[PDB]
Design an enzyme around this catalytic site. Structure first.
Site, mmCIF file in Angstrom:
data_model
loop_
_atom_site.group_PDB
_atom_site.id
_atom_site.type_symbol
_atom_site.label_atom_id
_atom_site.label_comp_id
_atom_site.label_asym_id
_atom_site.label_seq_id
_atom_site.Cartn_x
_atom_site.Cartn_y
_atom_site.Cartn_z
ATOM 1 N N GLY A 35 0.137 -4.116 3.728
ATOM 2 C CA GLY A 35 0.005 -5.550 3.892
ATOM 3 C C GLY A 35 1.315 -6.192 4.306
ATOM 4 O O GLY A 35 2.401 -5.711 3.981
ATOM 5 N N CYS A 48 -0.811 2.311 6.292
ATOM 6 C CA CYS A 48 -0.602 0.919 6.646
ATOM 7 C C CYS A 48 -0.285 0.121 5.388
ATOM 8 O O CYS A 48 -0.525 0.566 4.263
ATOM 9 C CB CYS A 48 -1.835 0.350 7.350
ATOM 10 S SG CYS A 48 -3.400 0.639 6.480
ATOM 11 N N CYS A 58 0.807 -1.217 0.000
ATOM 12 C CA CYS A 58 0.000 0.000 0.000
ATOM 13 C C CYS A 58 0.844 1.273 0.000
ATOM 14 O O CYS A 58 0.384 2.315 -0.484
ATOM 15 C CB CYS A 58 -0.943 -0.020 1.202
ATOM 16 S SG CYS A 58 -1.961 -1.517 1.301
ATOM 17 N N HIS A 98 -8.980 3.723 -3.122
ATOM 18 C CA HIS A 98 -7.618 3.362 -2.717
ATOM 19 C C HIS A 98 -6.932 2.623 -3.862
ATOM 20 O O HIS A 98 -6.821 1.390 -3.845
ATOM 21 C CB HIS A 98 -7.645 2.518 -1.439
ATOM 22 C CG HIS A 98 -6.313 1.969 -1.028
ATOM 23 N ND1 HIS A 98 -5.118 2.572 -1.357
ATOM 24 C CD2 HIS A 98 -5.991 0.867 -0.307
ATOM 25 C CE1 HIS A 98 -4.118 1.866 -0.859
ATOM 26 N NE2 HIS A 98 -4.621 0.826 -0.217
#
Ligand SMILES: O=C1N=c2cc([N+](=O)[O-])c([N+](=O)[O-])cc2=NC1=O
Lengths: 731, 399, 395
Positions: free
Chosen positions: C383, C381, C91, C351
């Site tokens: 993954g 944040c 991300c 996103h």
């Protein structure tokens, strides 16, 4: 979202589709535009189909199947070229919306939940085939003259009414592009059924609609779950050859643009690459998203300059010529019985073949029976290659060769009413050859001459009936070159023009009419093309760049290669005759810079392919490559102009030379100049002709005649005064 | 630009061949974890929490190599979860780019200790598996004249005048120096043998090597892009060239292999705190490019730029290491900069040992760290050509 | 040594997943469109001085494979020396590209760098690239792979965020995103997408539902035995309260973003005006099963590294992957409510994985300049349990 062009607020287009619903619930849409003899995808059609498609949805409970038919000699052919040629860049939104509306109608027809069958009675070309491709089943009548295909790439367009999207989903990316889209190939009904474009055939047109309704009745009974459902609208659909994400097709997919660039030789033709982009991009998404992408590339071509060039030449200019634009007005017909060809060279043998292929009895005379016999072998060699390819039967080929009678006796021209001489380029020879035959042939026979440069008026004095003497200029190889340059001598009567005009159409070639002047149109203009290249060679430009420049300009043959086949000794005496005319009139001859290169290669004993050596090397009758001594002789590499400068010099020389021919009265119309340059000497089709090139020039500095003159003046300041435009182009 | 970046460890796996290769059964994630476990074996007391990032080059990050394989290595090897993990792709230079990016992160001061390298299991994830925005887009592919690297190398040999014997002579030279380096023990401590989950040996040598290569054997090979059209496309740009002399074969081009490499990069304070001895210093890095159709002339401006950026000339460099993607590219590089032969790929190259795309840059970097120490020399310059005609060069200095 | 400045930060609008406007647009075209916009902003820019182009892309396959950054350089006609590299840190890829560009500028070995990201999720869905952490049973069985949505539901269960709490945050994101659009905040940075004919394809963020109500958010339904896997590690939790829906989670969209970064000398040489300075970057991590707790130590790290505290920061921009993640972040650092995601977030606007970090980064560059404020902290944040944070200062 609507099936119509407008949704707000006098004058509405007429109806072109007849409605009929039988007792079984089968609706028969019969397209019959009252404004012409052919159904066309114009504003009247779009509105008519919009009402019909709206009605199919409103009455879907009482409708079981649909049949799309036509009431014309043809099924459905083409779109509104008069409208698409006027589309400016600002009109891209209108063009986009139009094809989106057209495909929205065909998509509703396609997803009706009911079987739709196309009854193709005649030609279905372009938009016509796109309507049929939207149907679930296609039946064509194997009638004479019927053609099916998507030939819009030949006009600089693409199949924007679903043609790209559907063919790709029927045949896969590679097969649809190579076999149907990239070149707009036309197919006879038998060929159409063979490749999957058509499903069934019938012998007559009267069987179509019944067979269509029959297929509906059987499809409903046999396949009720998949009736009216295209293969790509089923859950388990798998594109033939794979999608771009499939590993097999992905391994060869990046080579498709390079192969296309190999075929086009780097020429600036945007339509084929737009078709390839739409095809591949469409295969990555759903059908509807694919269809909308197809519309965007289509709008990109319609508002571009190349499509306007191509539409101007291959539609408007061609139609004017084929409609007798250059033919004298009030002249009747005079059928031809027996054709007499004088000379069995490559030209005379090709003339006898295209005359026999048209169904004429030809007498092929030469100085010896051995020579005339080897001339007919040219026809046997082409027929033997057409037998292996399977394009003609043994019975039809035998009747073709049987119309060619090779002889060496002048008395065998008895009963000939059409003479086509193709001997050596020499006046007193043609004078002698015509004198030996003028009294044996019919007293009304046309006395045609295949001359490249010698004026027809001077050649006419060698016969008695100068009114029947005319120039009938063919191009090698005759079996493939589609133009005939008809040259009007001073004594040539208007009736003689029409007879050669009608003869040209009978053998399947395109005619132009040119007034007598040495060099005529084709030979004079093509001379400035090869002369510019030989100038660059003498200036020190690399030969490999010159050839690359000619190919990337769009020419079928690079100029040094073409020079080796025109023979440099012929180019020499062309300049000698030009130099004599000026210096006899008291003037001072300004030699072209290419003349020094010609005389140089003559001295070195490399006068061309016919004498074994030229700019290239020749072994075993095939071209080997550029002569290695070429770079040392002319200091190749000492001059390195931009490639575009080399390209423009060749194009502008012919464009400027065409404008002179129009000014001097050599040509009579821009249509003859464009088609004559394209079909005669191979001017690039993307230009739309050497005259269209002026009014439609597009460079980095602008577009149009004004930008042409600016670029011509740009070239003149750097390469010589010959690039200065005539006063006819100035303001 | 304050902190100096130092190389502390540089190791690699042996390179397994493409056909019936020993590494075909080994997942590319395991090739990296194996190198991580070797670093732990060499420094058992290192506080792995001080490792802030793991940067792996990978040209085909799909399948066994997708999902940020660098992050997968961090989690699978039990490294601290704060050690990050990023995959990058800069075609052939991906391995050296990862090292260069690791060094640049240390110089900025916002990273302390970084693992860098690459991984490419070409027998499991073949070149091209990831598709490609240029290949799947004919509108792009038509405009930017896409030409495979093999044809650019043939075009370089044609222009520069390198004969079929010339390129084969270099290929023989690479096989010889590679065999001499292996026989001389040069690679004994940097090539980490691959073992299975039971400790059983899988591969301990660069099995693509053909040390008994002869001049006559190379001359019997056939030239290599088998679909066609690319030659015409290439000559459309290089219109002054008439004919392309296809001289490159499988014996004078880089080998398709599997492998991986890891490099540990950190600041002076980072190694001092973890009790590490710095082996060499990253002096300068550079990125340039050249003609995209010829594609493989990119290493020259990147080398001149890294020399100018470090204030050095060719004479100041002791060892030159250039990836042996194609023999003509090396001979063009040597001809352009007048590189002495005794200084160029002194221990062999990809023609002999293979070219695992994403890992090659870190492999030949570590090859120079070991050879500088073995010879007690000062400077080495490492460079690789790149697809799309890019270039990456790096200067290191022994410490 | 050198200081890194932002000179331009633009993005495309974000097209939705179902029947989205950008679905017909190749991701390469999204990037090239933004390059052409920068040229329009500075036509006299000497592109030869651009030394690299760094793009984040989480699914670099198909239309996004083959170093899409290099493809952008070639397709847009940029100099061949301008480089081009693709990176994937899940991300944070968009922000990692910006941070890497800044760090390369600080090292002095790069002069002017283009950074950003691209993700066409309607054409290349996430997971299209495969991966060992998911498709290798040996290592999947060890790292305890759990989808990020379950990690978010777990966070809401532990911290005590009710279904009404996460929906209340989703509502204000829609309200603040709609207010930013209607207020003209995005008028300069969101570059509308057009086709080869100039026709408009998209000029706004389709995923936005500005007429969202709390009653509508309650009607939504929440989204392999992954619940048992998560509770095996977090053993003190009896049951996971699944509070996250498609209305309180990030939207799947298509988009791209570009950021031009260079040294003061590099900008002055090219007549560019700096807009903000990159103060500090940091990367940290947290539990790989709960996955989305990385931003808290990454934000703490970037504050200590810059000698700053929460009170020194004017704006906090955290990616709205899931509502509980942002509420966890707000609770931990005690972020004032009027400083957090002031212009709305991914719940409303979407996103687009690889591009998001560059989008929210440019969002704070504009909002600092519009409010005439000083500092902003941006974090996402990631993954796998990663965290990236960046502090910028208006100039
Ligand atoms: O061999 C040498 N290597 C050196 C390496 C370095 N180094 O930077 O690692 C330096 N230095 O620090 O100036 C000086 C050196 N002087 C030498 O003579």
């Amino acid at each position: 979202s609507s099936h119509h062009h407008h949704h707000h607020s006098n004058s509405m287009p007429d109806n072109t589709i007849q409605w009929d619903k039988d007792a079984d619930g089968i609706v028969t849409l019969t397209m019959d535009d009252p404004s012409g003899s052919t159904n066309v995808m114009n504003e009247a059609y779009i509105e008519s189909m919009g009402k019909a498609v709206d009605r199919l949805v409103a009455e879907k409970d009482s409708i079981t199947g649909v049949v799309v038919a036509s009431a014309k000699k043809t099924f459905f052919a083409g779109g509104d070229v008069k409208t698409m040629i006027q589309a400016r860049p600002e009109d891209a939104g209108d063009v986009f919306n139009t094809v989106e509306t057209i495909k929205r109608q065909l998509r509703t027809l396609e997803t009706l939940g009911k079987p739709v069958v196309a009854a193709i009675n005649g030609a279905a070309l372009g938009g016509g085939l796109e309507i049929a491709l939207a149907c679930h089943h296609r039946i064509a009548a194997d009638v004479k003259g019927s053609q099916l295909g998507l030939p819009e790439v030949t006009l600089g367009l693409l199949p924007g009414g679903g043609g790209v999207t559907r063919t790709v989903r029927m045949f896969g990316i590679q097969n649809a592009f190579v076999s149907v889209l990239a070149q707009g190939t036309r197919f006879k009904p038998a060929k159409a059924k063979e490749i999957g474009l058509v499903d069934e055939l019938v012998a007559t047109v009267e069987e179509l609609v019944p067979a269509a309704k029959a297929w509906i009745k059987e499809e409903l009974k046999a396949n009720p779950d998949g009736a009216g459902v295209q293969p790509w609208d089923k859950k388990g659909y798998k594109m033939p050859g794979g999608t771009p994400s499939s590993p097999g097709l992905a391994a060869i997919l990046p080579s498709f643009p390079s192969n296309l660039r190999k075929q086009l030789k780097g020429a600036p033709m945007p339509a084929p690459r737009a078709i390839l982009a739409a095809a591949v991009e469409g295969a990555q998404v759903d059908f509807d998203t694919a269809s909308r992408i197809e519309s965007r590339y289509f709008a990109s071509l319609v508002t571009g300059q190349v499509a306007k060039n191509m539409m101007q030449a291959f539609f408007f200019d061609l139609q004017a010529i084929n409609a007798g634009g250059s033919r004298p007005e009030g002249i009747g017909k005079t059928p031809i019985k027996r054709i007499g060809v004088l000379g069995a060279g490559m030209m005379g043998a090709g003339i006898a073949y295209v005359s026999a292929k048209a169904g004429y009895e030809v007498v092929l005379k030469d100085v010896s029976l051995e020579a005339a016999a080897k001339g007919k072998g040219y026809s046997e060699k082409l027929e033997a290659k057409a037998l292996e390819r399977g394009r003609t039967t043994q019975e039809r080929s035998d009747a073709l060769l049987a119309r060619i009678t090779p002889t060496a006796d002048a008395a065998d021209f008895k009963g000939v009413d059409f003479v086509i001489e193709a001997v050596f380029e020499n006046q007193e020879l043609k004078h002698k050859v015509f004198g030996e035959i003028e009294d044996i042939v019919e007293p009304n026979a046309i006395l045609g001459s295949n001359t490249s440069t010698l004026p027809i008026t001077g050649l006419a004095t060698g016969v008695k009936r100068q009114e029947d003497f005319i120039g009938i200029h063919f191009f090698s190889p005759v079996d493939k070159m589609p133009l005939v340059e008809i040259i009007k001598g001073e004594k040539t009567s208007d009736e003689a023009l029409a007879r050669v005009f009608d003869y040209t159409l009978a053998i399947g070639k395109t005619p132009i009419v040119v007034n007598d002047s040495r060099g005529f149109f084709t030979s004079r203009v093509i001379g400035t093309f090869v002369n510019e290249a030989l100038a660059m060679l003498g200036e020190g430009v690399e030969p490999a760049s010159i050839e690359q420049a000619g190919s990337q300009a769009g020419y079928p043959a690079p100029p040094l290669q073409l020079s080796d086949e025109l023979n440099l000794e012929l180019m020499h005496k062309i300049a000698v005759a030009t130099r004599k005319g000026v210096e006899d009139a008291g003037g001072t001859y300004q030699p072209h810079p290419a003349e020094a290169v010609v005389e140089k290669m003559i001295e070195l004993g490399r006068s061309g392919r016919l004498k074994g050596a030229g700019f290239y090397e020749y072994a075993d009758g095939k071209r080997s490559g550029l002569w290695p001594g070429l770079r040392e002789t002319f200091k190749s590499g000492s001059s390195q102009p931009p490639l575009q400068d080399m390209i423009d010099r060749m194009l502008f020389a012919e464009a400027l030379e065409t404008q002179k021919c129009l000014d001097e009265g050599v040509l009579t119309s821009t249509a003859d100049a464009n088609i004559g340059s394209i079909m005669g000497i191979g001017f690039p089709p993307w230009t739309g002709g050497s005259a269209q090139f002026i009014v439609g020039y597009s460079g980095p500095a602008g577009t149009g005649k004004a930008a042409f003159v600016a670029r011509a003046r740009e070239l003149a300041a750097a390469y010589g005064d010959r690039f200065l435009p005539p006063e006819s182009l100035l303001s | 630009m304050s902190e100096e970046a130092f190389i502390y460890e540089a190791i690699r796996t042996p390179r397994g061949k493409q056909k019936n290769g020993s590494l075909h059964e080994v997942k590319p994630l395991s090739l990296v974890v194996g190198l991580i476990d070797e670093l732990r074996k060499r420094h058992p007391d290192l506080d792995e929490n001080l490792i802030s990032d793991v940067i792996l080059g990978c040209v085909s990050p799909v399948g066994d190599q997708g999902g940020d394989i660098a992050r997968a290595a961090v989690l699978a090897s039990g490294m601290p979860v704060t050690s990050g993990g990023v995959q990058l792709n800069r075609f052939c230079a991906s391995g050296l780019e990862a090292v260069n990016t690791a060094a640049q992160k240390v110089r900025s001061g916002w990273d302390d200790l970084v693992l860098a390298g690459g991984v490419e299991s070409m027998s499991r994830v073949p070149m091209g598996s990831d598709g490609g925005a240029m290949g799947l887009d004919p509108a792009t592919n038509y405009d930017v004249m896409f030409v495979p690297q093999s044809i650019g190398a043939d075009l370089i040999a044609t222009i520069e005048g390198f004969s079929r014997e010339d390129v084969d002579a270099y290929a023989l030279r690479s096989q010889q120096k590679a065999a001499e380096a292996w026989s001389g023990g040069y690679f004994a401590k940097s090539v980490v043998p691959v073992r299975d989950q039971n400790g059983l040996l899988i591969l301990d040598h660069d099995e693509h090597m053909r040390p008994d290569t002869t001049k006559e054997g190379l001359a019997k090979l056939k030239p290599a892009a088998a679909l066609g059209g690319f030659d015409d496309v290439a000559l459309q740009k290089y219109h002054w060239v008439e004919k392309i002399n296809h001289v490159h074969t499988g014996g004078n081009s880089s080998g398709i292999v599997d492998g991986a490499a890891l490099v540990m990069i950190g600041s002076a304070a980072a190694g001092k705190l973890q009790g590490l001895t710095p082996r060499a210093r990253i002096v300068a890095t550079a990125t340039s490019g050249a003609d995209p159709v010829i594609m493989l002339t990119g290493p020259t401006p990147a080398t001149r730029k890294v020399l100018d950026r470090a204030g050095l000339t060719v004479d100041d460099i002791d060892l030159f290491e250039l990836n042996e993607a194609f023999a003509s590219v090396v001979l063009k590089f040597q001809k352009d900069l007048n590189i002495p032969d005794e200084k160029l790929n002194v221990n062999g190259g990809a023609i002999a040992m293979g070219h695992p795309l994403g890992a090659t840059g870190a492999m030949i970097l570590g090859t120079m760290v070991d050879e500088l120490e073995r010879r007690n020399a000062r400077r080495a310059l490492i460079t690789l050509c790149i697809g799309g005609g890019m270039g990456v060069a790096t200067i290191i200095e022994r410490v």
